[PDB]
Design an enzyme around this catalytic site. Structure first.
Site, short mmCIF file in Angstrom:
data_model
loop_
_atom_site.label_atom_id
_atom_site.label_comp_id
_atom_site.label_asym_id
_atom_site.label_seq_id
_atom_site.Cartn_x
_atom_site.Cartn_y
_atom_site.Cartn_z
CG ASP A 1 54.41 -13.06 -15.80
OD1 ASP A 1 54.29 -12.43 -16.88
OD2 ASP A 1 55.42 -13.70 -15.54
CD1 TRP B 1 56.80 -14.96 -23.38
CD2 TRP B 1 55.83 -16.96 -23.69
NE1 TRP B 1 55.81 -15.11 -22.43
CE2 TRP B 1 55.22 -16.33 -22.59
CE3 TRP B 1 55.38 -18.22 -24.08
CZ2 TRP B 1 54.20 -16.93 -21.85
CZ3 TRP B 1 54.35 -18.82 -23.35
CH2 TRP B 1 53.79 -18.16 -22.24
CG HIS C 1 52.09 -8.23 -17.58
ND1 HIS C 1 51.28 -9.29 -17.93
CD2 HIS C 1 53.18 -8.77 -16.98
CE1 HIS C 1 51.84 -10.42 -17.53
NE2 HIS C 1 52.99 -10.13 -16.96
#
Ligand SMILES: [Cl-]
Ligand SMILES: [Cl-]
Lengths: 297, 298
Positions: free
Chosen positions: B108, B154, B278
């Protein structure tokens, strides 16, 4: 306590099959329906409605689920808060008043109801004005880094519940004031009447009202987009004469050149920029009122 | 207090010009620096670091501003939380330990520090692994309706201060747990050790720490993107041998085919999906550890 910003307008609760629509009604002459957007209520027209009421029966309505209008229960596809469903409900509201053919101006979410109404039910409209928007399809199709940062709330408020609701609950007064401030040309609250801000703040202070706004944006990311997409692909154009106004410092002009975009959506469109951020009727009431009176007359 | 999830690892506070880096240090062998991302801390490595410590000197560091590392004061360009700056600060931290050439794996945000380090200072790296990312430039270039909805954070966390900070402050526990849960394969918190969740939750409960995370995302929308844009338009490729791992249900694969993208950025890249969301080192610890051990041992 909430100021009356429409001296001499009546106040009507209009029954529809999906709930009551609140409206201020004033003036006489041909009917003209004014529709607000996010995160406002009908009172955003308070500087412009009196000038329109010189020539028109002006109906200043809270959108379904907004302000004092009733909040229909939503469903898994956000159906009551799709612009198609909102337009059907407002058509039904206008029929209650005996107005089956009317002029329509909308701003922000209300402008989205308005052009969807013109696509679905063009016989209902004499003339259409839209303030500081492009069609929902066009915002999503132009999604890029710059636009994603500028209209971040299009994807934030469309997140599955209860994520936006919980975050908006973190500081709702700050959020509604931040949105009002940041989309003006000044960048602060000085363009707004403080009594109007209080109306917007009080509505936004209700969790159920904030939930409806999220449902509106969820519809905006899903069904509203799909409804627009069908029209784009079918080549369907708005046949009603329309006026597209946008703020020189507004939202619509950051995505594209607005009159060129609307010409792809409407057969008969005029357009003009107003020296303004997003909130044309409050940041630039005189220039907005003049353009609306001229077009609708 | 907070659990020690690295039995047998030492703890170091490494001074740099930009503030102290906290790290757990264990093992012996070639140096291997592991970098976490958002909204986590160095403890996300706690299931894979012991396997790696059998073969490597493993340094598990909190990123600048995260966890127990110091928080440099930010500025109008979010400079200390750009990946370029973070990379320089970690190079300095490694130099304090005598590591001027090391292996690196990041997840990440830490993976973004890592590929930026490799672009800026390739001579510092023997090999690089990135977990479940594409370059920042590629996320923004692929930002359409579907992806804007998928990685809305984001754009949201990059909004000007104090907008995200004020919203996040109403109920910080909700948001950190929502992000941890939403990006896993299962969609809940079952993949995480609850003791690790407490580390993440406690870090996120500090408003200064939350601000740093927003600055990191602001850098990610502005200077980080600009730095990447320069390199991609110049055809500057990472020359360090690299491994790209991603989750079959993770973030990187929603945007594109990860290996194709990375081949455009790296001259020597291998890649492999892992069945995982993730959070590869926690959702698929054994599979992640094995891929890393094999890659860094070659
Ligand atoms: Cl809008
Ligand atoms: Cl990331």
């Amino acid at each position: 306590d909430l100021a009356d910003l429409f001296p001499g307008f009546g106040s009507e609760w209009i029954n529809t099959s999906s709930g009551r629509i609140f409206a201020r009604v004033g003036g006489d002459g041909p009917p003209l329906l004014l529709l607000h957007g996010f995160p406002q209520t009908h009172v955003m027209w308070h500087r412009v409605a009196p000038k329109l009421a010189e020539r028109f029966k002006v109906i200043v309505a809270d959108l379904p689920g907004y302000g004092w209008s009733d909040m229909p229960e939503s469903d898994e596809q956000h159906t009551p808060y799709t612009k198609r469903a909102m337009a059907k409900q407002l058509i039904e509201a206008m029929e209650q008043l005996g107005h089956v053919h009317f002029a329509l101006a909308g701003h922000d979410r209300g402008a989205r109801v308005s052009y969807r109404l013109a696509l679905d039910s063009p016989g209902r409209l004499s003339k259409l004005a839209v303030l500081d928007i492009l069609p929902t399809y066009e915002y999503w199709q132009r999604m890029n880094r710059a636009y994603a940062l500028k209209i971040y709330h299009w994807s934030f408020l469309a997140q599955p519940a209860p994520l936006p609701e919980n975050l908006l609950g973190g500081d709702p007064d700050f959020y509604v004031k931040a949105k009002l401030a940041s989309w003006t040309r000044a960048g602060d609250l000085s363009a707004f009447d403080p009594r109007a801000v209080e109306h917007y703040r009080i509505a936004f202070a209700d969790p159920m009202r904030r939930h409806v706004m999220c449902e509106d944006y969820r519809a905006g990311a899903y069904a509203d987009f799909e409804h627009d997409k069908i029209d784009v692909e079918a080549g369907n154009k708005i046949p009603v004469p329309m006026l597209a106004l946008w703020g020189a410092s507004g939202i619509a002009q950051s995505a594209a050149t607005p009159l060129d975009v609307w010409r792809k959506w409407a057969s008969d469109v005029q357009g003009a920029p107003i020296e303004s951020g997003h909130f044309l009727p409050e940041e630039a009431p005189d220039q907005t009122a003049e353009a609306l009176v001229r077009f609708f007359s």
